């Protein structure tokens, strides 16, 4: 019934699974053959048999290479998703610079690469970590048609997004110092009074480098999240709404169900 929906019925197993039920393949894209960003890594599942899928455009932070996030992109592919995992023009950009790039990044996805047949380009997405997330931001306020936005442990002097309408999901690190929640995640969250839906999840004891590492937890909402708004999949608002009790490695959740 909905056109967008891909694989099984959802469990808390299948979430915190290392894949999820898609093979996945990889194609890299070179520095020396696009132009608005670095070049990166674009991850997606192997079978075309079951439809297109939505696809989500991720930036490392400040000083940091897509090696340093690399492992999402299988994880997240492997779900039903089209991964364009970037390096940036330079390690210093700044967030605006950041946004620009994965908005650049999804444009070649969808218009130029050669799995752009693979991708619905209606349902696109972004994320990243730090200045990345900042730059999640940026690129979510300058297209309101993007389906998803999740900043990770976000950096951003820019701390007011009233033009983001794209449900968004920020995951901070409790005890981050670099990108503080108190100073960058938890502005920004209280700031998206125009997002038609979001979120914010807290990483009890956590520090800025949670996502530099396989995590269960922030792979379990970020694929929910990913879900439930770039699919319209409805199955995965059982993990989002009512909001998980803030326990064990979660720190706090703010939410606005329902969805």
């Avoid at 592919?77 to 390096?87: L, R």
């Avoid at 070649?108 to 380009?121: E, G, I, K, M, P």
């Avoid at 970590?129 to 300058?142: R, Y």
């Avoid at 009512?242 to 169900?257: E, F, K, L, Q």
Wanted: charged fraction near 20%; hydrophobic fraction near 35%; glycine fraction near 8%.
């Amino acid at each position: 019934a909905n056109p967008y929906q891909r694989g099984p019925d959802p469990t808390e197993s299948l979430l915190r699974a290392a894949r999820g039920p898609f093979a996945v393949s990889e194609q890299s894209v070179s520095r020396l053959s696009v132009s608005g960003f670095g070049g990166g890594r674009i991850y997606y599942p192997t079978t075309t048999s079951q439809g297109t899928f939505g696809a989500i455009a991720i930036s490392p932070g400040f000083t940091a290479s897509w090696s340093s996030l690399a492992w999402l992109g299988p994880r997240l592919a492997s779900h039903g998703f089209v991964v364009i995992g970037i390096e940036t023009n330079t390690r210093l950009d700044q967030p605006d610079s950041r946004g620009r790039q994965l908005l650049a990044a999804l444009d070649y996805l969808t218009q130029r690469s050669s799995v752009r047949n693979r991708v619905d380009a209606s349902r696109l997405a972004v994320a990243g970590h730090s200045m990345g997330g900042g730059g999640t931001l940026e690129a979510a306020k300058s297209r309101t048609s993007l389906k998803a936005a999740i900043p990770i442990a976000p950096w951003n002097l820019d701390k007011t997004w009233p033009e983001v309408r794209t449900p968004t999901l920020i995951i901070g690190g409790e005890l981050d110092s670099i990108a503080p929640v108190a100073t960058h995640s938890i502005p920004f969250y209280n700031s998206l009074t125009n997002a038609r839906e979001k979120a914010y999840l807290e990483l009890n004891n956590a520090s800025h480098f949670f996502p530099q590492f396989s995590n269960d937890t922030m792979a379990k909402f970020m694929i929910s999240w990913m879900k439930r708004f770039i699919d319209d999949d409805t199955r995965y608002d059982q993990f989002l709404c009512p909001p998980p009790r803030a326990i064990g490695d979660i720190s706090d959740y703010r939410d606005t169900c329902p969805h």
